Design a protein around this ligand. Sequence first.
Ligand SMILES: *[C@@H]1O[C@H](CO)[C@@H](O[C@@H]2O[C@H](CO)[C@@H](O[C@@H]3O[C@H](CO[C@H]4O[C@H](CO)[C@@H](O)[C@H](O)[C@@H]4O)[C@@H](O)[C@H](O[C@H]4O[C@H](CO[C@H]5O[C@H](CO)[C@@H](O)[C@H](O)[C@@H]5O)[C@@H](O)[C@H](O)[C@@H]4O)[C@@H]3O)[C@H](O)[C@H]2NC(C)=O)[C@H](O)[C@H]1NC(C)=O
Ligand SMILES: *[C@@H]1O[C@H](CO[C@@H]2O[C@@H](C)[C@@H](O)[C@@H](O)[C@@H]2O)[C@@H](O[C@@H]2O[C@H](CO)[C@@H](O[C@@H]3O[C@H](CO[C@H]4O[C@H](CO)[C@@H](O)[C@H](O)[C@@H]4O)[C@@H](O)[C@H](O[C@H]4O[C@H](CO)[C@@H](O)[C@H](O)[C@@H]4O)[C@@H]3O)[C@H](O)[C@H]2NC(C)=O)[C@H](O)[C@H]1NC(C)=O
Ligand SMILES: *[C@@H]1O[C@H](CO)[C@@H](O[C@@H]2O[C@H](CO)[C@@H](O[C@@H]3O[C@H](CO[C@H]4O[C@H](CO)[C@@H](O)[C@H](O)[C@@H]4O)[C@@H](O)[C@H](O[C@H]4O[C@H](CO)[C@@H](O)[C@H](O)[C@@H]4O)[C@@H]3O)[C@H](O)[C@H]2NC(C)=O)[C@H](O)[C@H]1NC(C)=O
Ligand SMILES: *[C@@H]1O[C@H](CO)[C@@H](O[C@@H]2O[C@H](CO)[C@@H](O[C@@H]3O[C@H](CO[C@H]4O[C@H](CO)[C@@H](O)[C@H](O)[C@@H]4O)[C@@H](O)[C@H](O[C@H]4O[C@H](CO)[C@@H](O)[C@H](O)[C@@H]4O)[C@@H]3O)[C@H](O)[C@H]2NC(C)=O)[C@H](O)[C@H]1NC(C)=O
Ligand SMILES: *[C@@H]1O[C@H](CO[C@@H]2O[C@@H](C)[C@@H](O)[C@@H](O)[C@@H]2O)[C@@H](O[C@@H]2O[C@H](CO)[C@@H](O[C@@H]3O[C@H](CO[C@H]4O[C@H](CO)[C@@H](O)[C@H](O)[C@@H]4O)[C@@H](O)[C@H](O)[C@@H]3O)[C@H](O)[C@H]2NC(C)=O)[C@H](O)[C@H]1NC(C)=O
Ligand SMILES: *[C@@H]1O[C@H](CO[C@@H]2O[C@@H](C)[C@@H](O)[C@@H](O)[C@@H]2O)[C@@H](O[C@@H]2O[C@H](CO)[C@@H](O[C@@H]3O[C@H](CO[C@H]4O[C@H](CO)[C@@H](O)[C@H](O)[C@@H]4O)[C@@H](O)[C@H](O)[C@@H]3O)[C@H](O)[C@H]2NC(C)=O)[C@H](O)[C@H]1NC(C)=O
Ligand SMILES: *[C@@H]1O[C@H](CO)[C@@H](O[C@@H]2O[C@H](CO)[C@@H](O[C@@H]3O[C@H](CO)[C@H](O)[C@H](O[C@H]4O[C@H](CO)[C@@H](O)[C@H](O)[C@@H]4O)[C@H]3O)[C@H](O)[C@H]2NC(C)=O)[C@H](O)[C@H]1NC(C)=O
Ligand SMILES: *[C@@H]1O[C@H](CO)[C@@H](O[C@@H]2O[C@H](CO)[C@@H](O[C@@H]3O[C@H](CO)[C@@H](O)[C@H](O)[C@@H]3O)[C@H](O)[C@H]2NC(C)=O)[C@H](O)[C@H]1NC(C)=O
Ligand SMILES: *[C@@H]1O[C@H](CO)[C@@H](O[C@@H]2O[C@H](CO)[C@@H](O[C@@H]3O[C@H](CO)[C@@H](O)[C@H](O)[C@@H]3O)[C@H](O)[C@H]2NC(C)=O)[C@H](O)[C@H]1NC(C)=O
Ligand SMILES: *[C@@H]1O[C@H](CO)[C@@H](O[C@@H]2O[C@H](CO)[C@@H](O)[C@H](O)[C@H]2NC(C)=O)[C@H](O)[C@H]1NC(C)=O
Ligand SMILES: *[C@@H]1O[C@H](CO)[C@@H](O[C@@H]2O[C@H](CO)[C@@H](O)[C@H](O)[C@H]2NC(C)=O)[C@H](O)[C@H]1NC(C)=O
Ligand SMILES: *[C@@H]1O[C@H](CO)[C@@H](O)[C@H](O)[C@H]1NC(C)=O
Ligand SMILES: *[C@@H]1O[C@H](CO)[C@@H](O)[C@H](O)[C@H]1NC(C)=O
Lengths: 904, 147
Amino acid sequence: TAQSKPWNHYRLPKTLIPSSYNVTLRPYLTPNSNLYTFKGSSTVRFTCKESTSMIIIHSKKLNYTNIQGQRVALRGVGGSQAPAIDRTELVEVTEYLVVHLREPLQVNSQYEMDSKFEGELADDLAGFYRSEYTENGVKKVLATTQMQAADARKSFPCFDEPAMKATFNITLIHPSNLVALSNMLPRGPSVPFTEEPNWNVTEFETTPIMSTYLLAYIVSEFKNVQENTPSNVLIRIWARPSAMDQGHGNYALRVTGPILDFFSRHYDTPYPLNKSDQIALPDFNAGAMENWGLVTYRESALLYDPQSSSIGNKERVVTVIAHELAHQWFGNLVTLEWWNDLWLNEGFASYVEYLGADYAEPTWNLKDLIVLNEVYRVMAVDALASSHPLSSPASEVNTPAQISEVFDSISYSKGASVLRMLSSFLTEDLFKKGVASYLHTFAYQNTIYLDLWNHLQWALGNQTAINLPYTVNAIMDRWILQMGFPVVTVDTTTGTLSQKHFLLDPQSNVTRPSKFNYLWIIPISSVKSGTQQAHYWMPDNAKVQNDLFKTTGDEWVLLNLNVTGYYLVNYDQNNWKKIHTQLQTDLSVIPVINRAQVIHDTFDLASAQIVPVTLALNSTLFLNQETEYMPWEAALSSLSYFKLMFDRSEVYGPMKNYLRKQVTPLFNHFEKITQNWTDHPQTLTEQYNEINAVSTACTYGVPKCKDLVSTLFAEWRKNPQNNPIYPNLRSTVYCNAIAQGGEEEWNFVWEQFRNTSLVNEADKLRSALACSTQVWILNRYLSYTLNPEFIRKQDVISTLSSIASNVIGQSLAWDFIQSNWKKLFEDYGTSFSNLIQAVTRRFSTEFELQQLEQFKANNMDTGFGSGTRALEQALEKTKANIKWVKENKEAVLQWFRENSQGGS
Amino acid sequence: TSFFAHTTVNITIDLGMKRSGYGQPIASPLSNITLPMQDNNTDVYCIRSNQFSIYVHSTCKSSLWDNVFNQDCTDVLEATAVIKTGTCPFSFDKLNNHLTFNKFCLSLSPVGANCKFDVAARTRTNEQVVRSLYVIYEEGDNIVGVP
Ligand SMILES: *[C@@H]1O[C@H](CO)[C@@H](O[C@@H]2O[C@H](CO)[C@@H](O[C@@H]3O[C@H](CO[C@H]4O[C@H](CO)[C@@H](O)[C@H](O)[C@@H]4O)[C@@H](O)[C@H](O[C@H]4O[C@H](CO[C@H]5O[C@H](CO)[C@@H](O)[C@H](O)[C@@H]5O)[C@@H](O)[C@H](O)[C@@H]4O)[C@@H]3O)[C@H](O)[C@H]2NC(C)=O)[C@H](O)[C@H]1NC(C)=O
Ligand SMILES: *[C@@H]1O[C@H](CO[C@@H]2O[C@@H](C)[C@@H](O)[C@@H](O)[C@@H]2O)[C@@H](O[C@@H]2O[C@H](CO)[C@@H](O[C@@H]3O[C@H](CO[C@H]4O[C@H](CO)[C@@H](O)[C@H](O)[C@@H]4O)[C@@H](O)[C@H](O[C@H]4O[C@H](CO)[C@@H](O)[C@H](O)[C@@H]4O)[C@@H]3O)[C@H](O)[C@H]2NC(C)=O)[C@H](O)[C@H]1NC(C)=O
Ligand SMILES: *[C@@H]1O[C@H](CO)[C@@H](O[C@@H]2O[C@H](CO)[C@@H](O[C@@H]3O[C@H](CO[C@H]4O[C@H](CO)[C@@H](O)[C@H](O)[C@@H]4O)[C@@H](O)[C@H](O[C@H]4O[C@H](CO)[C@@H](O)[C@H](O)[C@@H]4O)[C@@H]3O)[C@H](O)[C@H]2NC(C)=O)[C@H](O)[C@H]1NC(C)=O
Ligand SMILES: *[C@@H]1O[C@H](CO)[C@@H](O[C@@H]2O[C@H](CO)[C@@H](O[C@@H]3O[C@H](CO[C@H]4O[C@H](CO)[C@@H](O)[C@H](O)[C@@H]4O)[C@@H](O)[C@H](O[C@H]4O[C@H](CO)[C@@H](O)[C@H](O)[C@@H]4O)[C@@H]3O)[C@H](O)[C@H]2NC(C)=O)[C@H](O)[C@H]1NC(C)=O
Ligand SMILES: *[C@@H]1O[C@H](CO[C@@H]2O[C@@H](C)[C@@H](O)[C@@H](O)[C@@H]2O)[C@@H](O[C@@H]2O[C@H](CO)[C@@H](O[C@@H]3O[C@H](CO[C@H]4O[C@H](CO)[C@@H](O)[C@H](O)[C@@H]4O)[C@@H](O)[C@H](O)[C@@H]3O)[C@H](O)[C@H]2NC(C)=O)[C@H](O)[C@H]1NC(C)=O
Ligand SMILES: *[C@@H]1O[C@H](CO[C@@H]2O[C@@H](C)[C@@H](O)[C@@H](O)[C@@H]2O)[C@@H](O[C@@H]2O[C@H](CO)[C@@H](O[C@@H]3O[C@H](CO[C@H]4O[C@H](CO)[C@@H](O)[C@H](O)[C@@H]4O)[C@@H](O)[C@H](O)[C@@H]3O)[C@H](O)[C@H]2NC(C)=O)[C@H](O)[C@H]1NC(C)=O
Ligand SMILES: *[C@@H]1O[C@H](CO)[C@@H](O[C@@H]2O[C@H](CO)[C@@H](O[C@@H]3O[C@H](CO)[C@H](O)[C@H](O[C@H]4O[C@H](CO)[C@@H](O)[C@H](O)[C@@H]4O)[C@H]3O)[C@H](O)[C@H]2NC(C)=O)[C@H](O)[C@H]1NC(C)=O
Ligand SMILES: *[C@@H]1O[C@H](CO)[C@@H](O[C@@H]2O[C@H](CO)[C@@H](O[C@@H]3O[C@H](CO)[C@@H](O)[C@H](O)[C@@H]3O)[C@H](O)[C@H]2NC(C)=O)[C@H](O)[C@H]1NC(C)=O
Ligand SMILES: *[C@@H]1O[C@H](CO)[C@@H](O[C@@H]2O[C@H](CO)[C@@H](O[C@@H]3O[C@H](CO)[C@@H](O)[C@H](O)[C@@H]3O)[C@H](O)[C@H]2NC(C)=O)[C@H](O)[C@H]1NC(C)=O
Ligand SMILES: *[C@@H]1O[C@H](CO)[C@@H](O[C@@H]2O[C@H](CO)[C@@H](O)[C@H](O)[C@H]2NC(C)=O)[C@H](O)[C@H]1NC(C)=O
Ligand SMILES: *[C@@H]1O[C@H](CO)[C@@H](O[C@@H]2O[C@H](CO)[C@@H](O)[C@H](O)[C@H]2NC(C)=O)[C@H](O)[C@H]1NC(C)=O
Ligand SMILES: *[C@@H]1O[C@H](CO)[C@@H](O)[C@H](O)[C@H]1NC(C)=O
Ligand SMILES: *[C@@H]1O[C@H](CO)[C@@H](O)[C@H](O)[C@H]1NC(C)=O
């Protein structure tokens, strides 16, 4: 049947396995009279494993210059006589080039296939593509390559399946004015192209065995900062000439060396290649790609300006460098057979990125923010009936579109969360030994997740100290083959633990089936009244008992120490109180990561109606004695919804006075350590809580905070060119200054916004202009949006959603979006979903729901475009918001009023 | 090199002043003391003369958040170095007065420091200690100082 035909199946036939490729590409970076275009020529050598009469290879958007009769030519290595090509056909859907042969190929015989082709160097961010940038008014264009998944076939005919690894000989014909880069260093110095002497020919060294998706070739006029490591590896940081002249990519050079060294010792495997080129591209939506030896990055993730960039950027560059460098071993040396297992590659790197970044910047304690940035991030989505298992059968991922769906928060963050739990029971040193065992045994090869488990189990067998009650395969099967995470409820009177699938909706329709009936094997580290207890292993059973969790009197138990595991913990009311009294009597006894747990967990349990909302708010009482970031951020994140629903309500006064009483101590703490806000801290966590202290103390009415904003802004208005405000506190001071002032302040920030070149500062000033308390100023600012000479097209959605955040601007913006819907949909519907989510985020009344419903009917003919799901989603959120307010408004008001004096 | 001579020791104390978040004058620890050069070393200067004179040269500079002192002090920030007595039985003024000592060495390093003077910045509003100047002294009459 036609359906049976091998060319109509997405997955490649395993009759031909490739050996090596010879790919020669010529990027034409000058527009054609009609399109930027690239010309190529490839020669692949393959071995027949099973006799077939047809060569099926991947080809996407490639026009072919016919060699002799057909598109390709076939030759034979050894005595192999190549069969004649009867006909060549191109299937577009499955992206294939089917070469029908007159006589079948021979088993275990090698053949070579030549091809000459041409394609479009379009701005598609896929394959050999062009990245356009404007430098000093001159529009310059560079040729770069994103080959992830399907895109490599777009540039050269290849077997684009990660399991079909091969060695590649990349040759580049580029203009002599521009530089040529690839995965490997050039074989020799560039030699001019004989046929056209305005071009050079860079032929690179042969690539190690590697997957087609990790290939890269970039032709650009970029510049570099070099550095040879003690391990004899060349580290080059490439970027636009302007950025390198300003020394923006020097932090990247300062950390790349130490990071590669750490991973070399951690994995016990020397860096496979000798070069680590890291390029920063102007427009890189992907953020970063782990191309081997040519890691492409977005300018915001490799470059750091120490005079304008906040510490948030210093964290992004050091951690993203640690992630794409971890892939050079785990993901590039030992790749994975298919994308059904993409979670292991991205999850492992998303965990070891914090390890490598801690080596580079050890003062920051980054290994503790994985709970906040990765675990807590993914739990919000894994606690829904719409989530998905980490691992799916390989047969389920076939379509290029199905391959892209594997790239999500579950695979990256929950993957890391599950692999951090492994490195907890397995003891890390054993975990390192197994990973090393895996990278040494399966080097230059492809693997199954079982292949890692096997090596990590063998590591335990070569040991007698750590003994696990179950196999590594089974323990992890519960976390990778089923969705969601468990909530452990411990009745301390009887010592009975219970597990249940945690879903944030009180009423939820989990329809997805599980082989383990939504019961997990949970590693349970516990503490009894400050002293660590023995480790526990709760089975895949709903309820069990153990005297480890049986308290008497003032004895309190706290589980998931340091949040190593991927589960929520609930105790009996009495034990919660004993934990809350300890957080008041003395908090140091409870670790910082567990002090955030008692906040995140309680609020998440309250959303599911497992515990009352009063218990969640109770967890925010020890914060008048807290100077740490994680416990404070966990509260400010959870109390954001409270503010969104109550900022325009009767109960905001009590809320503001409570959070003022609780933030006043924190503000005074930083005021002291910073000598009246002069000498700022040097640890990422502390610098972050300083922003939280300043911003929170201000939006809740701390007198001194208003004086600090006024002073800093006053000094800035004088001497405008030199800015006194610290890069980190600039955004808060700017927003506050605009809200505290009027037209003169707004007109200043607007003039500076229209004069600033740095997108970093422009966005800070633009988002600050939306904080105005004047109605007429906000409406004028809203009319500035309609004109693209005042606000860029891409800045419009973030400008509108910022005005909507102002309590005064919510009404003004909703009105503006309804009245200008057609124009906004015709431009952003083709991003817009997020606008209809930023606005309609506070919607909490039946009257607002009616307005949303009436608007849907009115603008049905125009249509909601990309946010059609979002307009429906906003209705469902508003309805869910109306329910929460009705059932929690009175309790929240009473609690805030009662605890208005802060905590003891 | 004659013991019987007058050696003038010029303590150049470059002063670093940073403006506070509430506009207050804040004195940075990054302010630097430059002792006269001796034995190819600015860290320590030992008096090798019967008569000595210790004089203070003070320069005020201003930094912003950067901690790079690129400009001159203006308004509240401006200040002048004042070497407070600190942990010593003698004031910086007493030394240039009729005071006799067998050996007198001013060092920026606390190694061998028999005593330590506290260098401060005196803004119209307040005087804030910045760095400390260590002194190693031996009681005697071989060396004395005066204006
Ligand atoms: C991308 O670049 C890489 C290099 O960076 C290319 O890899 C090279 O691939 C070619 C072809 O496979 C290799 O060349 C051949 O290697 C044979 C083995 O050489 C090795 O063993 C030697 C000791 O025996 C050792 O000294 C040497 O260093 C190396 O380790 C070598 O025997 C070949 O030379 C003879 O054979 C040729 C053809 O085979 C004969 O024999 C068969 C069997 O009977 C017969 O069918 C055939 O007709 C021939 O008679 C012959 O043409 C020669 O005249 C000679 O007799 C030859 O050198 C090369 O070694 C690889 N280099 C590296 C560094 O890997 C890669 O191929 C390229 N990609 C593409 C698509 O080409
Ligand atoms: C770091 O900042 C501290 C706070 O800074 C203040 O607040 C910020 C927001 C800005 O407004 C800033 O300009 C303010 O100074 C700062 O601590 C403060 O320092 C000032 C100056 O030393 C103190 O002012 C003096 O106060 C006393 C009275 O103290 C009583 O009243 C105050 C309230 O006014 C209470 O807070 C105290 O607890 C006491 O109950 C006054 O008597 C004195 O003036 C007298 O002397 C002058 C000169 O002779 C006369 O002209 C007057 O008539 C008076 O006789 C000052 O007004 C302020 O009290 C103090 N506050 C606190 C809480 O400590 C600190 O000095 C800064 N430190 C650094 C690092 O520079
Ligand atoms: C849950 O999470 C917490 C936080 O990560 C863990 O507590 C940490 O334990 C590690 C163990 O390595 C501590 O690291 C060590 O700290 C020692 C000093 O202890 C304290 O005192 C200093 C100064 O006040 C504080 O800054 C510090 O935060 C601690 O409070 C150091 O002396 C150790 O140095 C040793 O190791 C290094 C390794 O590079 C060697 O170079 C040294 O020569 C030396 O051998 C080390 O740095 C970490 O400080 C602890 N943090 C806190 C705040 O307690 C818990 O262990 C973890 N618990 C569980 C159940 O997983
Ligand atoms: C007391 O003396 C100390 C030295 O003991 C002086 O501090 C030095 O100040 C100079 C500037 O005058 C610093 O050199 C500068 O470095 C800046 C970036 O380096 C940062 O990181 C280093 C390492 O931590 C710090 O030392 C430094 O302070 C910075 O934090 C550059 O941005 C500066 O730019 C200048 O030179 C470049 C060319 O290199 C020019 O293009 C610029 O336009 C500009 O001229 C400069 O290179 C030096 O690093 C500081 N060393 C320290 C802090 O020990 C104090 O200035 C002085 N204090 C006083 C006068 O009270
Ligand atoms: C301890 O750990 C090793 C694996 O780790 C190695 O040794 C430690 C000490 C470190 O040096 C690491 O860096 C090393 O990688 C376990 O070895 C494995 O044992 C199992 C048996 O339990 C072996 O499985 C067998 O393999 C046979 C074929 O082996 C050959 O082929 C494989 C590849 O397919 C190749 O890796 C191997 O070297 C041989 O060439 C097969 O016939 C048999 O039926 C069975 O499948 C496995 O191959 C071993 N792996 C390696 C890499 O050595 C130890 O078992 C473990 N000890 C304990 C007690 O658990
Ligand atoms: C140590 O530092 C002193 C300066 O210290 C100041 O003075 C002492 C007394 C204390 O009060 C300190 O608190 C002060 O900070 C340096 O003295 C200076 O030396 C320079 C060397 O160039 C002298 O510069 C000269 O200036 C001349 C102009 O004025 C002099 O001459 C005219 C007549 O020409 C005369 O009218 C006037 O009275 C001065 O005598 C100029 O002609 C000459 O070419 C030269 O430029 C400067 O005058 C000195 N100032 C003072 C007040 O001493 C020491 O050099 C330095 N020495 C050491 C060893 O550290
Ligand atoms: C794929 O790409 C690789 C390179 O990345 C190609 O491999 C190279 O092939 C060339 C041509 O065979 C090799 O250059 C030859 O080397 C030999 C041995 O040293 C001789 O020196 C050759 O010189 C003699 O022959 C030429 C041509 O007849 C003649 O002009 C000259 O006077 C001499 O008689 C010399 O050309 C080169 O070393 C190879 N490089 C490597 C690293 O292997 C490979 O051929 C490409 N494959 C395909 C199918 O395109
Ligand atoms: C394109 O290919 C040509 C030819 O290889 C490259 O010319 C090369 O230019 C570099 C400088 O960028 C030359 O380095 C210097 O050469 C001079 C000799 O004139 C010597 O005094 C210095 O010690 C230094 O090595 C290189 O020699 C020169 N090669 C030539 C002329 O054959 C050109 O730069 C290439 N451009 C690209 C992007 O490939
Ligand atoms: C908008 O941005 C431009 C570019 O930054 C600003 O131009 C700058 O204007 C300042 C003030 O005139 C110039 O400062 C100069 O300092 C030197 C001493 O270092 C002095 O000799 C000059 O007379 C002048 O005062 C600065 O050089 C100049 N920079 C450039 C590249 O034009 C402009 O002032 C900004 N307008 C605002 C902030 O609204
Ligand atoms: C590859 O070939 C296709 C045609 O098979 C080219 O598409 C044509 O482009 C011309 C010029 O713009 C149009 O007039 C034709 O109508 C297009 N036909 C189709 C079917 O698209 C395409 O431009 C070629 N690409 C390259 C870079 O060679
Ligand atoms: C939140 O904490 C408060 C105390 O801060 C708890 O209030 C106590 O509740 C018990 C049991 O009803 C009473 O016996 C106490 O007298 C109450 N004390 C105060 C000061 O009100 C409250 O129960 C906690 N809520 C939750 C759900 O944990
Ligand atoms: C990398 O270095 C090794 C030696 O450690 C060398 O054998 C290999 O050829 C080099 N590859 C290059 C230059 O890319
Ligand atoms: C859950 O989904 C099933 C299948 O769509 C449906 O039959 C059932 O009524 C749903 N139940 C709830 C509670 O929504």
